[PDB]
Symmetry: D3
Subunit: 257 residues, 6 copies
């Protein structure tokens, strides 16, 4: 009926897990400012959309996504001084991932794909996985396998990059509310993007270090780390296809039928 | 426009908070089995739906809802031994609520309505609020106000109850996947309900005590605590309006514009 | 000798546990204001007294009671803003329950009755039990059984309620320092109750929601949620025999020799 | 007319704290094996008894005692491998002390005397105090003062030691269930002591290091670290009076009127 | 005398802090496998050596370094399945950083440079800083400034990269026990590096995702992610001067006299 | 050729552990003021020096030492109000010890000697050990043995004490920056001691209780608890050999081949 676990009855879910090779996917996002031109739930919407499409291709199921993520960092997300951005402490995010894995194992599930959509989440997701696997080991369970990834890492083909950045690629480091996400949003949730509001400032540049308390003067006023002026639905559809295809293939490789 | 914070840009959010009487609403649900006839994200869908309607009428905003809640208890949700049900440890839920309040305070927001949709969440939501307010006090903030409630508590009117349970009301204690929720779902998400699957068993009853480890034999096989056979969109619509109107008035009273 | 573990030598205790079917009882109370007419250790004294009597009747033992419980809530205990009331954070209470169960398992005990006397403790006791049972499982122990209850839940019989509330029962929700506890104290510790100090105010009434920071104005001045003016030692003796008999029978059922 | 906070109404407590010079005392014990001749709640009973007598002489109030303490260590309490002994994890004890100090400060109290009765508790009580004071500081409170002491430390005077130990004193290192404690119990709770069970074994001695997992063979079979055969009521009455007087003086010195 | 705080008397340290503009530097490393050719304390030795030289150049002091860091990750450090590697859980590392910052603030210090030498530590160092700064804020301190950096990030000049990697720079992703660290060790601790033990395997290549439990088969047998065959003392001297010069300038900029 | 794990390659370490009888030693110190005449890293340097010499004699290996320890206490370290002293919270130190033991067990190691050099660390090291052993049990490991000791406890022989304190030994209670440690430092790191700066003040003494917030006036201005004027290299060389020999024998006794 649906690839979303939340829309299934427990009997339907139980039956899918009973199959023996059931793959579950968990989107991990954040509520974070994304400039003057885009909504703040982008980091949840994108990995969730990708999960949905991948799940439909490989016959997987998608768990409710984590709506709040780790604190936004200046050099990757603009900084946690912006209003709207609502961040969790590291222990909180870590504990959430850990609890979910513990429960999935209780269900009998043994295959999980954690799809991150918020850069800063990475290491806390990692600690959550480790702490959960540690407990499972104490419970005599060592066959639970986890694949963790950030969907954008699948866009590495030079050909695609050239098509996405005709004037050259500066790296994902400045991709917060920039061309990459804005394009994907234009292809998935266009009504949540107001391109005319984009502030066309030069790419953010930082020295090889970080400063705390976060200094607002060091992040472009709009919150974006690069201009999304050249973003488009076409680019978004290209990104989506590349991500969906590459991830579906990776999951097939790691969790063969 | 949208009443969902996640769909706003940080500038739009900032402007609403800048108004001075901005009311924020946070749905807190769970992924929990709800019988053979209904999906598992009910505890998220319902309080979120009520929040949306209330927010539209009073000019409030709704934060992304918490998808996972505390462990299901036998006497209220059937028990955490059911597959599908994916629960958090108490410290995790408490920490999530606490972090969000801390961040909302940072934004300059001072009015929050926590709408619970999962009975078992209550005390951990309470602790999250207390710990957060304790920190705000240390930070020199004492004007942050929180109103917490479970939407179903607003169905008090005997006339309404009579209209909802023409055969006599047995209490909310057995209302897990029963008439109350099923009726709401029939009016909001009919495609996520199939009354034909309803197992018409007698209302669950228990002795005045609890037993751990949870014993599956003490919970009706389907997971429901009462039959939803008499559920109807009509009953659902009545319930919805009653809750929306009552909650809207409660908020107008506690957070006068 | 005694039914109190603290009054036994480790040799005696060891011998009792060696019986193989030894039942242990742990009272969990609190230090909380109980109006102008009763002392603040009521939530410890009452469950302890019930445990003592039940333990004597069925041959069980009683562990030292927890003297401090979770934060008093307005709608059930008046609120944590009252002086005298000395509350623990949830993690502290949960951890205390968890540590004790771990230790009892180490002793070889496998049967525990947790008798709550402070309404607000419930869910934290529940979490303590779950976390402890989780650990025991990792330790290879799955035969530890726990029965958790609040002594007042055993007073259900309409004929009993009738005698206790001839003018009509309004529910346990207003029973903080009211007729129920005051009657029990009059029968158990008359010297710690001064009925002449009772403030006969109308029953506390609240809207279908909760407000934080707790608003002192919403709780009856004396701290009571209802008047104990009609309390009596005779009503207390009835309540005691009903609770002792009901609980004793419950334990015989769950923990047969 | 009680010195115990638990036996006072919140109004009586409030009035005493309103004096502005109220001294509060918190007994901290443990449930620990104490040989074949004595009960296990000794570490709670003694400091409580001393607190009662001191409070009566200086006009102080006594808080409910902590019934469970830190894990028993071989060289001082016999070891945590003994049945009956029910110990808390360090974080639990620390958190308990921290929570109480926070609440007492909320009451407006500013003078606390923690009376330890279980040697192993010391450092966790210290951490609890430090964490609480750090927190009070954030709340703008720096006038909260705490005095921590173990009643036995007030038995210094060689003259007194002479009477207690004629054949020479050997330090409190082996004073667990020995002459010192048994004598106090014979004077306070003789019904909880049976010298006819005292195993007259040689004083326990250990190498200059500790071993974990704890080795049972390194602790005298009885659980005691020294024989209490020569214990007596007379000796107890001596110790008691010396401790009560000495401690009362110290409190008058630290919390001068 | 020495730039190491540990080798100063508390009087000397106090005098330096009393200067009002004293900069403290804290090396954060790890105990981790570094192939067959280098010792396991490299992540401590390197940042410490850089701090030493930077401190001497701009007159700062160096705090004792953190010897244990976060769990080694496959794609960055080879994996935590290797023997020798001794890692801390995230909460432990975060808490250590938090504690030290709190203490330095107590000293009156307000300038800190956290120099990371183990890639995986980064986000836990960040959380330590945030939690510590949050507390300081509660204490009324908002003038404590922190500069966090990984020393290798200062080697970015194209001309410098060309010299170090004439064949072509493949990126820092594969720099664990490779050319970069080995060259530095050759120049700083030649006796702890045996280049003749280097296993000249192809650069480690990984798909755009991570797998847990870590699969030993996915990491080159030696533990290195790239061959240090072309490492040299001369390349090390170049890296050292670039790092020391770049970092010293950064500190002069962020912490002017 | 090195006894330090940090200076070994993972292969060398692996080989030593593969033997099956490898003994590991973990120095646990602190950064703490030690008067006007000595450096602050003393508590790390001494236990480490002893570990090195013991390891060389019995064939053990020395892990990187813990540089930061628990808060300094007035009666033993002068107090945590002194500048320079940088202390961890109890949970942090406990967690660090716990994580290391967990990792060593993962390596296959099963014999650990924890050598404390900072008195105040004791109980938190104990808790870390207990929590780790508890975890190991859940993992099916019960053959991990730990020996905890403070190197100064092996210096008790009257013949030795006589030479060290020919004028009378007052106990280790006042041994903070006194003759004992200063003598060891004069023998191991004379450059880190300026005996001319010693403040020949009378031995510190305190009432039989503690006060918090710590009162500065109760600690000798210098920070020392006893004058080290009597210190000498010869005395240190005596202590060193005594400890090294005693500890080596103790280890041979507990971890026999
Ligand atoms: C830099 As991002 C995709 O977490 O906004
Ligand atoms: C008892 As319910 C509304 O949380 O499923
Ligand atoms: C509501 As009550 C029995 O915990 O005071
Ligand atoms: C050594 As004791 C007084 O804590 O039993
Ligand atoms: C990748 As590294 C410098 O932490 O070994
Ligand atoms: C009393 As000490 C050796 O920890 O300074
Ligand atoms: Mn993001
Ligand atoms: Mn529910
Ligand atoms: Mn109560
Ligand atoms: Mn004891
Ligand atoms: Mn590393
Ligand atoms: Mn020390
Ligand atoms: Zn984003
Ligand atoms: Zn529901
Ligand atoms: Zn009560
Ligand atoms: Zn004792
Ligand atoms: Zn490295
Ligand atoms: Zn020292």
């Amino acid at each position: 009926k649906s690839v979303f676990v939340g829309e299934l009855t427990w009997k339907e879910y139980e039956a899918r897990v009973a199959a023996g090779d059931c793959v579950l996917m968990l989107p991990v996002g954040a509520l974070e400012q994304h400039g003057h031109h885009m909504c703040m739930n982008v980091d949840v919407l994108l990995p969730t959309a990708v999960c949905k499409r991948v799940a439909e291709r490989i016959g997987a199921l998608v768990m409710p996504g984590l709506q709040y993520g780790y604190k936004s960092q200046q050099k990757s997300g603009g900084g946690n001084h912006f209003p709207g951005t609502t961040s969790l402490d590291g222990a909180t995010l870590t504990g959430t991932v850990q609890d979910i894995i513990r429960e999935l194992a209780r269900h009998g599930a043994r295959r999980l794909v954690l799809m991150n959509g918020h850069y800063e989440n990475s290491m806390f997701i990692v600690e959550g996985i480790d702490l959960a696997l540690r407990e499972l080991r104490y419970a005599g369970i060592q066959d639970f396998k986890v694949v963790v990834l950030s969907y954008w890492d699948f866009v590495k083909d030079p050909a695609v990059i050239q098509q996405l950045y005709p004037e050259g690629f500066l790296g994902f480091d400045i991709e917060h509310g920039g061309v990459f996400e804005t394009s994907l949003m234009l292809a998935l949730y266009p009504d949540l993007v107001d391109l005319d509001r984009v502030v066309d400032h030069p790419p953010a540049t930082f020295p090889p270090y970080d400063v705390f308390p976060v200094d607002p003067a060091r992040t472009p006023a709009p919150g974006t780390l690069s201009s999304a002026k050249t973003a488009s639905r076409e680019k978004g559809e290209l990104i989506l296809e590349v991500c969906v295809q590459g991830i579906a293939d990776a999951i097939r490789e790691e969790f063969p039928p």
